Scaffold this active site. Structure first.
Site, mmCIF file in Angstrom:
data_model
loop_
_atom_site.group_PDB
_atom_site.id
_atom_site.type_symbol
_atom_site.label_atom_id
_atom_site.label_comp_id
_atom_site.label_asym_id
_atom_site.label_seq_id
_atom_site.Cartn_x
_atom_site.Cartn_y
_atom_site.Cartn_z
ATOM 1 N N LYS A 50 0.818 -1.210 0.000
ATOM 2 C CA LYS A 50 0.000 0.000 0.000
ATOM 3 C C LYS A 50 0.857 1.267 0.000
ATOM 4 O O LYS A 50 0.428 2.317 -0.482
ATOM 5 C CB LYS A 50 -0.939 -0.011 1.212
ATOM 6 C CG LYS A 50 -1.862 1.198 1.342
ATOM 7 C CD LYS A 50 -2.841 1.294 0.182
ATOM 8 C CE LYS A 50 -3.981 2.253 0.502
ATOM 9 N NZ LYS A 50 -3.486 3.596 0.908
ATOM 10 N N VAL A 55 -0.648 1.484 -5.792
ATOM 11 C CA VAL A 55 -1.307 0.432 -5.030
ATOM 12 C C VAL A 55 -2.221 1.035 -3.968
ATOM 13 O O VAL A 55 -1.760 1.723 -3.058
ATOM 14 C CB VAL A 55 -0.289 -0.509 -4.356
ATOM 15 C CG1 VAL A 55 -1.007 -1.548 -3.508
ATOM 16 C CG2 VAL A 55 0.589 -1.182 -5.402
ATOM 17 N N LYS A 62 -6.426 -7.602 -2.011
ATOM 18 C CA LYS A 62 -6.225 -8.771 -2.858
ATOM 19 C C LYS A 62 -4.886 -9.442 -2.565
ATOM 20 O O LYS A 62 -4.771 -10.666 -2.617
ATOM 21 C CB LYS A 62 -6.312 -8.385 -4.337
ATOM 22 C CG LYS A 62 -7.715 -8.020 -4.797
ATOM 23 C CD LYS A 62 -7.743 -7.692 -6.280
ATOM 24 C CE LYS A 62 -9.170 -7.591 -6.796
ATOM 25 N NZ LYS A 62 -9.946 -6.537 -6.089
ATOM 26 N N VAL A 93 -5.530 -12.506 -30.500
ATOM 27 C CA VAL A 93 -5.449 -12.363 -31.945
ATOM 28 C C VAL A 93 -5.364 -10.886 -32.306
ATOM 29 O O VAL A 93 -6.222 -10.096 -31.913
ATOM 30 C CB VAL A 93 -6.663 -12.996 -32.652
ATOM 31 C CG1 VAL A 93 -6.559 -12.810 -34.160
ATOM 32 C CG2 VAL A 93 -6.776 -14.468 -32.295
ATOM 33 N N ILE A 96 -8.423 -8.458 -33.062
ATOM 34 C CA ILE A 96 -9.570 -8.775 -32.223
ATOM 35 C C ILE A 96 -9.429 -8.093 -30.870
ATOM 36 O O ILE A 96 -8.612 -8.495 -30.045
ATOM 37 C CB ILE A 96 -9.732 -10.294 -32.010
ATOM 38 C CG1 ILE A 96 -9.992 -11.001 -33.343
ATOM 39 C CG2 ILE A 96 -10.869 -10.579 -31.038
ATOM 40 C CD1 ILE A 96 -10.280 -12.484 -33.205
ATOM 41 N N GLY A 179 9.185 -6.820 -29.121
ATOM 42 C CA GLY A 179 7.893 -7.383 -29.467
ATOM 43 C C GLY A 179 7.538 -7.091 -30.910
ATOM 44 O O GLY A 179 6.787 -7.834 -31.543
ATOM 45 N N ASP A 180 8.083 -5.994 -31.428
ATOM 46 C CA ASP A 180 7.886 -5.605 -32.819
ATOM 47 C C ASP A 180 8.999 -4.664 -33.264
ATOM 48 O O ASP A 180 9.908 -4.357 -32.492
ATOM 49 C CB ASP A 180 6.514 -4.945 -33.017
ATOM 50 C CG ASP A 180 6.265 -3.787 -32.056
ATOM 51 O OD1 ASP A 180 7.237 -3.207 -31.527
ATOM 52 O OD2 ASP A 180 5.083 -3.452 -31.834
#
Ligand SMILES: [Cl-]
Ligand code: NA
Ligand code: NA
Length: 315
Positions: A50, A55, A62, A93, A96, A179-180
């Site tokens: 916290k 946070v 949780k 995908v 999507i 990632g790309d």
DNA sequence: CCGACAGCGCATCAGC
DNA sequence: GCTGATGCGC
DNA sequence: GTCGG
């Protein structure tokens, strides 16, 4: 240290974005996951976490449940839910999003196999995203990024030697994997015609670019592949005006935390920096006309800041 | 208590 | 046909 | 979901 917690938060983030379509809760969980990931201690309680920025009460609660039970009742139930897990999965995908995934699942389309049986219901982007589903989730080793860079820079120079190309993203920061590939393109004749098209065509000619997701006058998004069989990779090419190029390079190099800090420091020196320009501020707070930029260092010079090498722009 | 939280480029959808 | 909204990726 | 006006 806190992998169990960061995984939990990441999973919560995904379901918020893809199922609940709550984009800000998604970014809230991610922000919390990130700051916890850089917390150099094993968290023992929600109260401890916290203290970290990002946070709050709910996540702290949780964490307490997770540290006491090893799981989250909410998460476990969401996982066991056929509808929610199917919606969440289909968003993996490319093309999507939450809306399409919900649309597909509502009509019985829940699996990758279901998508292949229903090609007539997918747009061009989604078909390509489906075709390279596995490849798109694979990381790109830096050595491969280097080979891809050599091809881009070479072919771009062959179209016109006065072009300027810069591969940005985490790659420019020296990341071991990407990632790309995000390419920033400019030309002295393009400031604030049909230049992007000629570059895309050439890369298609030597069969580097294999597919097209979206294409306009200033931004290209598509699929590329190294010559052998290498996985197909996502690549973006942005055509930026010459007087806005290095502001763009700075912006798309990152990181996001670095940009936020640099913008903050800029304001303290009387300048405002966005993606496109750096402007001086008046006494009333009015932004003036764009300042001339001929290099990344020029932006650092304006705000009286020591030039940060891209390798050290993680924060 | 309540709005900000990045938002632009392109493809597609909704409506006239 | 058009204009504007929505979806999506980054 | 969290932060801050
Ligand atoms: Cl939200
Ligand atoms: Na906190
Ligand atoms: Na997706």
């Amino acid at each position: 240290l806190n992998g169990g917690i960061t995984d939990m938060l990441t999973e919560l983030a995904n379901f918020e974005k893809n199922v609940s379509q709550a984009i800000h809760k998604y970014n809230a969980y991610r922000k919390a996951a990130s700051v916890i990931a850089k917390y150099p201690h094993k968290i023992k309680s929600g109260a401890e976490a916290k203290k970290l920025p990002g946070v709050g009460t709910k996540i702290a609660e949780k964490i307490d449940e997770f540290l006491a039970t090893g799981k989250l009742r909410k998460l476990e139930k969401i996982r066991q839910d056929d509808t929610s897990s199917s919606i969440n999965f289909l968003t993996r995908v490319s093309g999507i999003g939450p809306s399409a995934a919900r649309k597909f699942v509502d009509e019985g389309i829940k699996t990758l196999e279901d998508l292949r049986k229903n090609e007539d219901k997918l747009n061009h982007h989604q078909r390509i995203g489906l075709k390279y589903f596995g490849d798109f989730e694979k990381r790109i080793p830096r050595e491969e990024m280097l080979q891809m860079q050599d091809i881009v820079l070479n072919e771009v120079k062959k179209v016109d030697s006065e072009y300027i190309a810069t591969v940005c993203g985490s790659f420019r920061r020296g990341a071991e994997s990407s990632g790309d590939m995000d390419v920033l393109l400019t030309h002295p004749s393009f400031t604030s015609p049909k230049l992007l098209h000629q570059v895309v065509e050439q890369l298609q000619k030597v069969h580097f670019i294999t597919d097209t997701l979206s294409k306009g006058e200033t931004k290209f998004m598509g699929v590329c592949q190294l010559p052998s069989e290498y996985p197909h990779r996502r690549i973006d090419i942005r055509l930026i005006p010459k007087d806005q190029y290095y502001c763009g390079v700075l912006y798309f190099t990152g990181s996001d935390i670095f940009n936020k800090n640099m913008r903050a420091h800029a304001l303290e020196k009387g300048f405002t920096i966005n993606e496109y320009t750096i402007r001086p501020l008046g006494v009333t707070g009015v932004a003036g006309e764009p300042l001339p930029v001929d290099s990344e260092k020029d932006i650092f010079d304006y705000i009286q800041w020591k030039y940060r090498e891209p390798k050290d722009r993680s924060e």
